[PDB]
Every structure is written in structure tokens, then in C-alpha cells.
A paper describes a structure:
Natural competence is the term used to describe the uptake of “naked” extracellular DNA by bacteria; it plays a significant role in horizontal genetic exchange. Previous work on T. thermophilus HB27 by Friedrich et al. identified a locus containing five open reading frames (ORFs) associated with natural competence. Four ORFs (pilA1 to pilA4 [pilA1-4]) were type IVa pilin-like genes, and a fifth, comZ, encoded an unusual and much larger protein that lacked some of the sequence features characteristic of pilin genes. Mutation of pilA1-3 and comZ leads to a loss of natural competence, although piliation is maintained.
Unlike ComZ, each ORF was positively identified as a type IV pilin by PilFind. Although all three related pilin structures share the same fold, the subdomain is consistently absent. ComZ binds specifically to the competence-associated pilin PilA2. Virtually no reduction in DNA mobility was recorded in the presence of PilA2 alone.
Author numbering:
A (entry chain A): 32 to 202
B (entry chain B): 30 to 202
Amino acid sequence: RASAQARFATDAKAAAVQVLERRSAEVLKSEIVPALSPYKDAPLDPDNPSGNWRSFYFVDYYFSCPTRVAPSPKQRGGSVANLRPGLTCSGTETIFGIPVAWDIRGENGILGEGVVTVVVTATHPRGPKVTLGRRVTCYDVYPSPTQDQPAPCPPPGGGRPGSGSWSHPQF
Amino acid sequence: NLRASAQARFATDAKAAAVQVLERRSAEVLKSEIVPALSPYKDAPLDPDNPSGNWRSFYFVDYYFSCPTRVAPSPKQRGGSVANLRPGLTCSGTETIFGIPVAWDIRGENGILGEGVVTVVVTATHPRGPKVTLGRRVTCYDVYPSPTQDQPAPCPPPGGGRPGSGSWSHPQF
């Protein structure tokens, strides 16, 4: 009985991992785009802005999820019109009959600047649940941001506005 | 483009190291052992009609109340005493996996939201650059056998977890 539950738990974890891996890879994806693309983030050659640029999906997920926020003028022209429209922030995948809830979101406030979390929960039909997360920062894309070339990191104060929370045991 | 390939491989390796450590530390949180009725670490009797028989002990309780600092449980769990939490657990540390340091931390969460929740968080930092941070959230409901109404262990009673730490966050600050 212990054995059977342990097997279901192992499977729930494997289902969780496969969704966490795929959704995290989306956050870290980049693409080469022309200088006319609204989704450009950094030029391949800083001395040739008329040439190709790299575009990081990190920026699209960070500012779109769970709700759309305009970036600072330093990223995507400060406009939500220049975030990719095709994206899904959350959902449920079924992996060998195991439902896995998943969510991608940017963090907010100064602490959340340039951070995206990916969180999954697999709920095995026979009981066991497994919840996994991955924390991705703007520094984790390739190539690495530098002082001179900060994208896809936002400038200070250029992330998602702080949502606010006041917790206390007295409450 | 060489560098891109190399860094992707190092990132894959960093992820594998993080997973290994996350699995080992999460398994520790979920571990149980059979103990006699006289054990200070007893949580639930194996037979609900025979408390004189053997008991199950959940390490979940030890990690939840010991990490990152030791807090006394409520009188319903471990006799309400830090003396009845297992000594010599490690809450945090660094493991090196094929030359990749992995920071790891187990802790109970606090306040009403944190009641009966333990997090396990790891960060693998590849010497050549790539970092990978993974977490697992474990609740008292995830042990085997599952807690029930008539047998809640290792879940604390309402108000019987780690006291809330407090945090006042606001963009005005």
C-alpha cells in the first residue's frame, strides 16, 4: 500500500518535472529579429543597431504575466503593444492522466525586478501531489546581461510595480 | 556560437545537480520511521485502538519545527517541547555535485499561511557561470499515510505551527 502510493508519487513528480522543464525553457527562449521588430531587446552588435537584434521571451513573460504591465521606456519602447500577444501565462497539462497546473509570472516590487517564477502542481488521481518551482532571473539568459548591455534586465524601478502586502500575527 | 553551446551544456549540468540535491533533501522531509510508544518522537499510533503498540514518527515534524530555528510545537505535538525534536538535523548547507556547488535549505513556513508547510530550495552555481534555482513545497498532507480528521498528525492543530514573522511591504517604501 505504501509501495503503490510511492509509485504514484514518483509518477506525479515526473509529470511535474516535465511541465516545469517545458515552461521554464519558454521563459529562457530567445530569437534573432531584425531591427524593425517591435520585440527587439539588444543588438547583436552594439555598433550596428541597423543589423539584427536578440529578442528575449523573458521580457514578454515578465511584463505580461499574470497581467500586462507597460515596461519602462528602456524596454520594448515602454509599450504593452510591443509585448508578444501569443502567450499563455497559466494552464493545466495532462501528463499520462495526471493533471499538472502550471503558472508563469513576473515578480513585482524592487525585490521582484527581473525575476520570473514558474510553479507547477501535479495532482495524481490516486492522491499524491507534487509542487515544484523554478526561479529564473534576467541574468540567466544567454548571452549574460552586462553593465553596458543590461537587457533583458529592467533598469532600476523599471519592473512590475510592487503589489503591497501587510502580514502580521496580530491580524 | 561555441560559447552558446558550452553554456547550454553547463546549464543542463547545473540543473541536474540541483535536481539531485532537491530530491535528497525533500526525501528527508518526507521520511518516516517506526518507533515504540515510549519514543519522544512518536506522532501517530500504527493501530488507532492500541496506543501501547508501535507508532509512526514523521521527520516532517522535526524539520518543520527545527528549521531554520527551533520553535516549540503545540502541546498536541511532541509534548509541546523542543526537547522532543530530533537533534543533529541539518537545515541548510552546500553540496558539491561533479564540481558544481549546490546551496540547499529546508525550512518550515510560518504564520497561518505557513502552517504545516515545509519548503526545500536549492541553487546550483556552475563554476563556468550558469545558475539554477529549484524549489519544492511539501505539506503535512503529503506524508504516508495521509493525515485524516481523526488522525491529523503530522499536521499541527490550528494555531500550532511556527509563529508568523510579519512583513510590511509597500511600493511607498
